[PDB]
Design a binder for this molecule. Sequence first.
Ligand SMILES: *[C@@H]1O[C@H](CO)[C@@H](O[C@@H]2O[C@H](CO)[C@@H](O)[C@H](O)[C@H]2NC(C)=O)[C@H](O)[C@H]1NC(C)=O
Ligand SMILES: *[C@@H]1O[C@H](CO)[C@@H](O[C@@H]2O[C@H](CO)[C@@H](O)[C@H](O)[C@H]2NC(C)=O)[C@H](O)[C@H]1NC(C)=O
Ligand SMILES: *[C@@H]1O[C@H](CO)[C@@H](O[C@@H]2O[C@H](CO)[C@@H](O)[C@H](O)[C@H]2NC(C)=O)[C@H](O)[C@H]1NC(C)=O
Ligand SMILES: *[C@@H]1O[C@H](CO)[C@@H](O[C@@H]2O[C@H](CO)[C@@H](O)[C@H](O)[C@H]2NC(C)=O)[C@H](O)[C@H]1NC(C)=O
Ligand SMILES: *[C@@H]1O[C@H](CO)[C@@H](O[C@@H]2O[C@H](CO)[C@@H](O)[C@H](O)[C@H]2NC(C)=O)[C@H](O)[C@H]1NC(C)=O
Ligand SMILES: *[C@@H]1O[C@H](CO)[C@@H](O[C@@H]2O[C@H](CO)[C@@H](O)[C@H](O)[C@H]2NC(C)=O)[C@H](O)[C@H]1NC(C)=O
Ligand SMILES: *[C@@H]1O[C@H](CO)[C@@H](O[C@@H]2O[C@H](CO)[C@@H](O)[C@H](O)[C@H]2NC(C)=O)[C@H](O)[C@H]1NC(C)=O
Ligand SMILES: *[C@@H]1O[C@H](CO)[C@@H](O)[C@H](O)[C@H]1NC(C)=O
Ligand SMILES: *[C@@H]1O[C@H](CO)[C@@H](O)[C@H](O)[C@H]1NC(C)=O
Ligand SMILES: *[C@@H]1O[C@H](CO)[C@@H](O)[C@H](O)[C@H]1NC(C)=O
Ligand SMILES: *[C@@H]1O[C@H](CO)[C@@H](O)[C@H](O)[C@H]1NC(C)=O
Ligand SMILES: *[C@@H]1O[C@H](CO)[C@@H](O)[C@H](O)[C@H]1NC(C)=O
Ligand SMILES: *[C@@H]1O[C@H](CO)[C@@H](O)[C@H](O)[C@H]1NC(C)=O
Ligand SMILES: *[C@@H]1O[C@H](CO)[C@@H](O)[C@H](O)[C@H]1NC(C)=O
Ligand SMILES: *[C@@H]1O[C@H](CO)[C@@H](O)[C@H](O)[C@H]1NC(C)=O
Lengths: 167, 420, 198, 99
Amino acid sequence: LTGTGVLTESNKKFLPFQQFGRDIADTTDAVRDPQTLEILDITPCSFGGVSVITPGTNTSNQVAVLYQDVNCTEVNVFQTRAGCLIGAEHVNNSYECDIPIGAGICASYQTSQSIIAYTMSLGAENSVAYSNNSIAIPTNFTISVTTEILPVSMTKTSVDCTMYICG
Amino acid sequence: YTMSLGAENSVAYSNNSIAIPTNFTISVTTEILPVSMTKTSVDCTMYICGDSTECSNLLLQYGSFCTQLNRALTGIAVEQDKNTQEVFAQVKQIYKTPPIKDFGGFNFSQILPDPSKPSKRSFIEDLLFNKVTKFNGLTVLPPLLTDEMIAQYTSALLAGTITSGWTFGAGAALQIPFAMQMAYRFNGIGVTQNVLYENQKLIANQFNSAIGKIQDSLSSTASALGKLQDVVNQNAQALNTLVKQLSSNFGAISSVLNDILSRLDPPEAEVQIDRLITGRLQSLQTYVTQQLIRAAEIRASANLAATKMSECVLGQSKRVDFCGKGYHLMSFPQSAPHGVVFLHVTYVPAQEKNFTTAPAICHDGKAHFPREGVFVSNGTHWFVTQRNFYEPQIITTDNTFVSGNCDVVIGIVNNTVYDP
Amino acid sequence: SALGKLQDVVNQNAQALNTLVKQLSSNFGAISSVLNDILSRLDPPEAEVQIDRLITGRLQSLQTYVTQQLIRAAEIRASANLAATKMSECVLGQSKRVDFCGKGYHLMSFPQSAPHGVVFLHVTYVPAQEKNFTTAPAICHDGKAHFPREGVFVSNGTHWFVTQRNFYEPQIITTDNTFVSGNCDVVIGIVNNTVYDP
Amino acid sequence: TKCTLKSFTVEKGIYQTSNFRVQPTESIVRFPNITNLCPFGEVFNATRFASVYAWNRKRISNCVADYSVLYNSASFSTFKCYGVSPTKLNDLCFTNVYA
Ligand SMILES: *[C@@H]1O[C@H](CO)[C@@H](O[C@@H]2O[C@H](CO)[C@@H](O)[C@H](O)[C@H]2NC(C)=O)[C@H](O)[C@H]1NC(C)=O
Ligand SMILES: *[C@@H]1O[C@H](CO)[C@@H](O[C@@H]2O[C@H](CO)[C@@H](O)[C@H](O)[C@H]2NC(C)=O)[C@H](O)[C@H]1NC(C)=O
Ligand SMILES: *[C@@H]1O[C@H](CO)[C@@H](O[C@@H]2O[C@H](CO)[C@@H](O)[C@H](O)[C@H]2NC(C)=O)[C@H](O)[C@H]1NC(C)=O
Ligand SMILES: *[C@@H]1O[C@H](CO)[C@@H](O[C@@H]2O[C@H](CO)[C@@H](O)[C@H](O)[C@H]2NC(C)=O)[C@H](O)[C@H]1NC(C)=O
Ligand SMILES: *[C@@H]1O[C@H](CO)[C@@H](O[C@@H]2O[C@H](CO)[C@@H](O)[C@H](O)[C@H]2NC(C)=O)[C@H](O)[C@H]1NC(C)=O
Ligand SMILES: *[C@@H]1O[C@H](CO)[C@@H](O[C@@H]2O[C@H](CO)[C@@H](O)[C@H](O)[C@H]2NC(C)=O)[C@H](O)[C@H]1NC(C)=O
Ligand SMILES: *[C@@H]1O[C@H](CO)[C@@H](O[C@@H]2O[C@H](CO)[C@@H](O)[C@H](O)[C@H]2NC(C)=O)[C@H](O)[C@H]1NC(C)=O
Ligand SMILES: *[C@@H]1O[C@H](CO)[C@@H](O)[C@H](O)[C@H]1NC(C)=O
Ligand SMILES: *[C@@H]1O[C@H](CO)[C@@H](O)[C@H](O)[C@H]1NC(C)=O
Ligand SMILES: *[C@@H]1O[C@H](CO)[C@@H](O)[C@H](O)[C@H]1NC(C)=O
Ligand SMILES: *[C@@H]1O[C@H](CO)[C@@H](O)[C@H](O)[C@H]1NC(C)=O
Ligand SMILES: *[C@@H]1O[C@H](CO)[C@@H](O)[C@H](O)[C@H]1NC(C)=O
Ligand SMILES: *[C@@H]1O[C@H](CO)[C@@H](O)[C@H](O)[C@H]1NC(C)=O
Ligand SMILES: *[C@@H]1O[C@H](CO)[C@@H](O)[C@H](O)[C@H]1NC(C)=O
Ligand SMILES: *[C@@H]1O[C@H](CO)[C@@H](O)[C@H](O)[C@H]1NC(C)=O
């Protein structure tokens, strides 16, 4: 029985007649060593998605790499709850989110220029001078015009199923 | 049994009798809406052909079937953050309440953030979070906005609503005493503000009791959040089905790819692998399609939640039963796992009396109509009162207007109109 | 980027068609993706098998395309219904719905056509400048509690005025601006002033 | 990223392009330690065989099976395998073998 994975010690009490274990996906979970009757867990060799955080190629060819849901171990290194971010400088100052990373962390290309990562700002802090006998009434106003854009239709495609399949 | 369609209750209708409420109750209702769904991501290559070069090479013969599924799942994952952003990130600034909770007797300590917690969530939010509860290329992405940030956004929206009414939604947050804010909310439903001011203590006590009842309901009725628990369950079920699909043979001699490769020569292994690839690719396409349809439903729900947030929390809704049963006064947002919960505070008429009515009153031959409200009679004297609350006033020339004469209005009765 | 919502729609449809066209290059297990190369090389007993493989692959590709088009069409239909709702309750009327027709108090909207879409220009009134005024829920005159018919009572520190809620425009407090209900012993926070009788 | 998007220009944003996997460094081969050769000689090269109605069955257990001789010998007129391939047989264990 072959495969690839990390073989580790286990506390799984296999019965004397059982030789292999299986997971929900029917893959091998653990094996009994044919020479020494101990149970070894098989953990697939660590893995995760790889995301590239980049400004457009019309600006710079510098990129940052996010290794999703992993520790900064097996892989200017910033560990976030989104994964291990390598190549982006960690900046204490918050800004508006530009290129989102996840878990509250966003990245952008800023200053000499490089990719930075930071916790995104939610908005300016502005306390209200509330009291039980004070009301604020506007004395002036502005007329503003905003633009709201909505899709209405999509391209009316038509496919000749017979000619497409059997031209 | 045959189900009952509610209790039967006939209305004592007649052409000259009107029922006007004499008392009222302030009620708080809970509306729960899904906002987002789990941001799943599937590595189509590792899922179909895990650690097998031969399977991957056979998979390449299907072209873009793999990468278009990665694209569809990416699109869903992105719109889940768009949905969260549209529902909660509607305020440009982070507002905070004053240290003194002098809100006219209205107790908000159960919906405002608790500074003593590791995450500044409200008591009710804590109750909500306590009710809602692999290695095959299937991963879950974190949301862009963490639970702490969502709690901060709901805190900003709640503090804005409490301290500035609707002004923070339209523009700047304009401070106003809470009692005056409620006075405007009452005028907006056709009840004169003096009703609020005269009964402010009663209204505040009813509000506080309604909130306590909300806490008892959420703390005792597990099914209250079923609309959100089902969403979590649906995504878990979808992933479990996908994982279970790896155990299927799809016509192959074995579901385990390594057992095929270790036993058959390429001329036969390629056929068995093609069978497994076809089965697993069809399984992925089914999963992705189900995720796209469910995501469209979630998006529609998120749009509804955003509409309610804007036209319910930030303003005042004139739309009947849009923001709960009754005449809407105000609503308070609360965050929840993968969703939003609205606490709608509404005015509901509570007690009524049978009064005799008339469309108009004759004085000197002129037909007098109310400027606001209706004419009522307790059997001996005629009064004018607001439609939604019994508050009899003497009929005067400053309450009514004259149009036409007694020979036109059907059902007009004789009385006198006092001239101040 | 202002029109990204419409450019993305064009791109999505182009991508779907480009994917469909690229799907013609796949073998799906056949000896060749080109149907004529199969027919020119194999006898019917084998050509039919290779063709069945290509037909299965291309038919599955079409089903995927059609499903994606139906879902995208449902999304577009929902968006079109929203656009129609805004047109009716925004351009043709006046919206009382907060933030339905842009941030601020809605005044009017103007439709504009766009490729595969509609653009609304929403003209709104937004309060711009404010002052801190002292207020009171009611004013006592002869023991009667007077409430504003419209607007609120404000004080600049020496005189009480009544003004509309959304715009500072102080007026003298008179019997034609307020109404009487109850007395001074009921309203919490009522202050003393005078009410002018025209 | 450029390969993932099939373009030489990448727009501003974050793209998922691949998957990190720590590759194995070495193979680990484990088998029960046993030097007995499976008695394939006295099964095939036996002097006398049984009638087909009374076909003789032999049980092979606890021995190293050298299948090389079999597919390498050219005496056999018919050699066909089902469910498994001859080439991948020498590197494969079995609970029991029946002849
Ligand atoms: C309300 O604000 C507007 C601008 O926001 C004021 O208009 C400006 O007035 C100044 C005079 O102090 C002019 O120099 C500017 O050119 C005006 N701007 C525009 C666009 O016309 C307006 O005067 C303010 N109203 C009040 C009553 O203060
Ligand atoms: C309107 O209804 C409320 C409750 O629905 C009444 O408040 C109660 O009044 C009784 C006296 O009749 C008290 O004993 C209760 O303790 C009150 N309850 C609360 C919560 O305050 C109120 O009196 C009614 N008003 C009218 C005019 O009928
Ligand atoms: C608002 O209500 C909360 C409880 O719903 C009040 O907090 C309680 O205060 C009393 C003291 O009078 C304590 O004995 C309770 O244990 C507290 N309970 C909780 C849950 O904190 C709070 O004081 C009320 N606020 C106002 C202004 O009345
Ligand atoms: C209808 O309302 C009028 C006004 O309140 C009542 O008239 C008063 O009745 C009381 C008796 O409780 C007298 O003390 C007042 O002097 C009366 N005022 C006037 C102006 O008549 C009348 O009795 C009510 N009728 C009914 C059937 O309830
Ligand atoms: C209300 O009052 C008017 C007059 O003030 C009543 O009109 C009378 O109608 C009768 C029947 O047609 C005539 O005979 C009288 O001459 C009318 N009065 C006058 C002054 O011309 C009317 O009927 C009264 N309605 C009620 C319901 O009492
Ligand atoms: C509050 O507003 C009133 C009304 O204008 C002010 O009273 C006027 O003050 C001016 C001084 O600039 C005098 O010339 C007027 O004769 C006053 N009129 C009246 C009716 O008193 C008052 O001074 C303002 N107070 C503050 C603190 O701004
Ligand atoms: C508003 O004016 C009234 C008088 O019109 C004040 O009432 C006085 O209250 C004190 C304290 O209870 C009594 O000793 C006086 O006798 C009351 N006056 C009268 C004429 O009865 C009231 O206190 C004033 N309120 C404010 C906030 O100034
Ligand atoms: C790239 O950036 C330059 C500005 O330096 C701009 O003029 C050019 O149009 C941009 N090209 C694209 C394809 O965006
Ligand atoms: C990574 O590993 C270190 C110890 O090697 C541990 O302290 C840290 O918490 C880990 N981080 C994550 C995100 O698992
Ligand atoms: C950011 O601030 C923390 C203190 O909260 C400090 O420990 C850290 O070194 C700072 N990092 C940078 C890059 O300024
Ligand atoms: C009003 O009249 C109807 C007549 O059927 C009666 O049933 C109802 O109880 C009356 N309302 C009150 C408050 O008495
Ligand atoms: C109400 O109806 C009755 C009979 O249907 C009629 O006698 C009476 O005059 C009517 N009242 C009015 C005000 O129309
Ligand atoms: C009202 O008073 C508060 C006191 O904190 C102040 O911050 C605010 O700026 C004042 N309003 C205006 C318009 O200046
Ligand atoms: C407003 O609050 C202050 C202290 O918080 C209090 O002294 C004052 O009397 C209150 N005013 C009213 C009208 O309740
Ligand atoms: C079979 O056994 C005989 C002994 O009778 C021997 O001569 C012969 O060479 C053997 N053949 C093989 C293939 O072992």
